[PDB]
Design an enzyme around this catalytic site. Structure first.
Site, short mmCIF file in Angstrom:
data_model
loop_
_atom_site.label_atom_id
_atom_site.label_comp_id
_atom_site.label_asym_id
_atom_site.label_seq_id
_atom_site.Cartn_x
_atom_site.Cartn_y
_atom_site.Cartn_z
N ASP A 94 0.91 -1.07 -0.13
CA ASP A 94 -0.03 -0.08 -0.05
C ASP A 94 0.93 1.32 0.12
OD1 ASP A 94 -2.04 1.84 0.51
OD2 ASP A 94 -2.61 1.23 2.28
N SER A 148 -0.39 15.67 -11.90
CA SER A 148 -0.87 15.46 -13.28
C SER A 148 -1.09 16.92 -14.05
CB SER A 148 -1.96 14.49 -13.32
OG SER A 148 -2.46 14.51 -14.76
#
EC number: 3.4.23.22
Length: 330
Positions: free
Chosen positions: A35, A199
């Site tokens: 994770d 992004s």
């Protein structure tokens, strides 16, 4: 040193991925959920409330000659999806894909919430976010990656998740045969303890690319792709019959639809998520309504590049002094 381990989807929907991990002496092998969105290594164990174990393999520290109780230390964690666990702490030897850390904090669950009990395929979690998020108290503990770093050939690990197929976590090296073209690296903020990056935009299907900054985390521990409501709406508007259902808890679409791809920007580079990756199947057995793999992050508080996005790429988690993230197509 380096390590290399295969990671395998837990079910036909790629809901999560498990990676075998050796704990203790002699080895006890448990299948853990790696994770990058948390920082505790915790396991089902001989201490876990018996009624909360249903099929998992448990860590038994009394059978490990190298296990030592970390006296006084406790832990308690809650995840984004509302699940939780807690218990006490041992140190023991932990090996991943041939890479061995001694004195690793192995957090032993005394309690787990129902979602963990109900998932018999996941024996625990291995956190790979920054150690500043580790929940052990009163003495915070380091992740497996942080402990291994100094021994590693290069201070990196890579995530190469499969679509309906096995993939790979590598530690300490970049497998240049595992991706196509070049790796594009982008800046990371550690200010919240996550692999947080920005992004550069998106496209829906064969549509034109929209340049726009999207701050989010690279999180292998989250199944789906969670993005701003504007973005998600633009995507699902291209699927006939798609809608947001409050009763179901997100965007659903007719199972008869063909989904468009989704492109996200990494600097000047582009990662394309095939439409098939965004299909998470019937909302219930036999339903002709299917659940979408792109969902709104509104009310989460953060955008999450989860497995739907990450499995479309070869991803480098660079834990050098100045951490960065790298994305390549594959």
């Amino acid at each position: 040193s380096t390590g290399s381990a295969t990671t395998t989807p837990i079910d036909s929907l790629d809901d999560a991925y498990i990676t075998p991990v050796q704990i203790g002496t002699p080895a006890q092998t448990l299948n853990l959920d790696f994770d990058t969105g948390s920082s505790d290594l915790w396991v089902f164990s001989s201490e876990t409330t018996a009624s909360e174990v249903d099929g998992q393999t448990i860590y038994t520290p009394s059978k490990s000659t190298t296990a030592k109780l970390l006296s006084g230390a406790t832990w308690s964690i809650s995840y984004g999806d509302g699940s939780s666990s807690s218990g006490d702490v041992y140190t023991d030897t932990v090996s991943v894909g041939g890479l061995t850390v001694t004195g690793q904090a192995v957090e032993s669950a005394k309690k787990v919430s129902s979602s963990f009990t109900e998932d018999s395929t996941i024996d625990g979690l291995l956190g790979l976010a920054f150690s500043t998020l580790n929940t052990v108290s009163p003495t915070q503990q380091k992740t497996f990656f942080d402990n291994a770093k100094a021994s590693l050939d290069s201070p990196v690990f890579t995530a190469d998740l499969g679509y309906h197929a096995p993939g790979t976590y590598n530690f300490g090296f970049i497998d240049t045969t595992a991706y196509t073209g070049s790796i594009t690296y982008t800046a990371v903020s550690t200010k919240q303890g996550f692999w947080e990056w920005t992004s550069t935009g998106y496209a829906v299907g064969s549509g034109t690319f929209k340049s726009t900054s999207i701050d989010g985390i690279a999180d292998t521990g989250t199944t789906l792709l969670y993005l701003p409501a504007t973005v998600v709406s633009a995507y699902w508007a291209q699927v006939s019959g798609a809608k947001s259902s409050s009763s179901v808890g997100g965007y659903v679409f007719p199972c008869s639809a063909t989904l468009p791809s989704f492109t996200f920007g990494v600097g000047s580079a582009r990662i394309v998520i095939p439409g098939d990756y965004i299909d998470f199947g019937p909302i219930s057995t036999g339903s002709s309504s299917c659940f979408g793999g792109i969902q709104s992050s509104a009310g989460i508080g953060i955008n999450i590049f989860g497995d739907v996005a990450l499995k479309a790429a070869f991803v480098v988690f660079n834990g050098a002094t100045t951490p960065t993230l790298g994305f390549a197509s594959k």
